[PDB]
């Protein structure tokens, strides 16, 4: 239709393709980060779980003393929701 | 010059090159949402555990005066790291 139109029919198509390579590329990097954020979370779950487990042990160890502070702690440990 | 079959192939070829990019973005955006559920589901557990540890911290702090070595052992665990 125009000599300079075929220039912007060529360029429009080129820039449309570009934004797809820029999507795949940045979707690939977001994706990589999420894989590491998932490993970091699984690590923090264990780290916290370890603490709660050792705290449970110290409480079971002192069952005899019937300290109501330890019972309050145990009530927290075995809580739900 | 342009053969009637080279214009049939140049068409299909492009229409396929574009098709593998939409199929990449698609499956990449699918994988991305599956990672997002995974990380939010893990973070929910992190928060549940964090909540207990934090409430336990408060109890040890309000009994600071008691100087109970059991509580000190407990706060030692709370502030502990692997180094």
Swiss-Prot record, chain A:
It comes from the Eukaryota. The chain holds residues 26 to 70 of 664 of the full protein. In the arteries, prelamin-A/C accumulation is not observed in young healthy vessels but is prevalent in medial vascular smooth muscle cells (VSMCs) from aged individuals and in atherosclerotic lesions, where it often colocalizes with senescent and degenerate VSMCs. Prelamin-A/C expression increases with age and disease. In normal aging, the accumulation of prelamin-A/C is caused in part by the down-regulation of ZMPSTE24/FACE1 in response to oxidative stress. Changing residue 38 to S: In EDMD2; no effect on protein level; no obvious effect on nuclear morphology in cultured skin fibroblasts from heterozygous patients. It comes from Homo sapiens. Changing residue 8 to D: Found in a patient with autosomal dominant Charcot-Marie-Tooth disease; uncertain significance. This is Prelamin-A/C. There is a cross-link at residue 7 (Glycyl lysine isopeptide (Lys-Gly) (interchain with G-Cter in SUMO2)). Residues 9-45 are annotated as: Coil 1A. Changing residue 16 to H: Impaired lamin assembly. Proteolytic cleavage of the C-terminal of 18 residues of prelamin-A/C results in the production of lamin-A/C. The prelamin-A/C maturation pathway includes farnesylation of CAAX motif by protein farnesyltransferase (FNTA and FNTB), removal of the last three amino acids (-AAX) by RCE1/FACE2 and/or ZMPSTE24, methylation of the C-terminal cysteine by ICMT and endoproteolytic removal of the last 15 C-terminal amino acids by ZMPSTE24. Proteolytic cleavage requires prior farnesylation and methylation, and absence of these blocks cleavage. It is found in: Nucleus lamina; Nucleus envelope; Nucleus, Nucleoplasm; Nucleus matrix.
Curated annotation (Swiss-Prot), chain B:
There is a cross-link at residue 8 (Glycyl lysine isopeptide (Lys-Gly) (interchain with G-Cter in SUMO2)). It comes from the Eukaryota. Changing residue 15 to S: In MDCL and EDMD2. Residues 10-46 are annotated as: Coil 1A. Changing residue 39 to S: In EDMD2; no effect on protein level; no obvious effect on nuclear morphology in cultured skin fibroblasts from heterozygous patients. It is found in: Nucleus lamina; Nucleus envelope; Nucleus, Nucleoplasm; Nucleus matrix. Signal peptide: none annotated. In the arteries, prelamin-A/C accumulation is not observed in young healthy vessels but is prevalent in medial vascular smooth muscle cells (VSMCs) from aged individuals and in atherosclerotic lesions, where it often colocalizes with senescent and degenerate VSMCs. Prelamin-A/C expression increases with age and disease. In normal aging, the accumulation of prelamin-A/C is caused in part by the down-regulation of ZMPSTE24/FACE1 in response to oxidative stress. Proteolytic cleavage of the C-terminal of 18 residues of prelamin-A/C results in the production of lamin-A/C. The prelamin-A/C maturation pathway includes farnesylation of CAAX motif by protein farnesyltransferase (FNTA and FNTB), removal of the last three amino acids (-AAX) by RCE1/FACE2 and/or ZMPSTE24, methylation of the C-terminal cysteine by ICMT and endoproteolytic removal of the last 15 C-terminal amino acids by ZMPSTE24. Proteolytic cleavage requires prior farnesylation and methylation, and absence of these blocks cleavage. The modification Phosphoserine is found at residues 27, 42. The modification N6-acetyllysine is found at residue 8. The modification N6-succinyllysine is found at residue 8. Belongs to the intermediate filament family. It is linked to Emery-Dreifuss muscular dystrophy 2, autosomal dominant: A form of Emery-Dreifuss muscular dystrophy, a degenerative myopathy characterized by weakness and atrophy of muscle without involvement of the nervous system, early contractures of the elbows, Achilles tendons and spine, and cardiomyopathy associated with cardiac conduction defects. Emery-Dreifuss muscular dystrophy 3, autosomal recessive: A form of Emery-Dreifuss muscular dystrophy, a degenerative myopathy characterized by weakness and atrophy of muscle without involvement of the nervous system, early contractures of the elbows, Achilles tendons and spine, and cardiomyopathy associated with cardiac conduction defects. This is Prelamin-A/C. The lineage of its organism: Eukaryota, Metazoa, Chordata, Craniata, Vertebrata. The gene is LMNA. The chain holds residues 25 to 70 of 664 of the full protein.
């Amino acid at each position: 239709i125009t000599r300079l139109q075929e220039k912007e029919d060529l360029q429009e198509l080129n820039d449309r393709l570009a934004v797809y390579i820029d999507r795949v590329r940045s979707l690939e990097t977001e994706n990589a980060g999420l894989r590491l954020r998932i490993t970091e979370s699984e690590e923090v779950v264990d780290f916290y779980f370890g603490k709660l487990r050792n705290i449970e042990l110290i409480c079971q160890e002192n069952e005899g003393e019937n300290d109501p502070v330890l019972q309050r702690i145990v009530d927290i440990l075995y809580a739900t929701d």
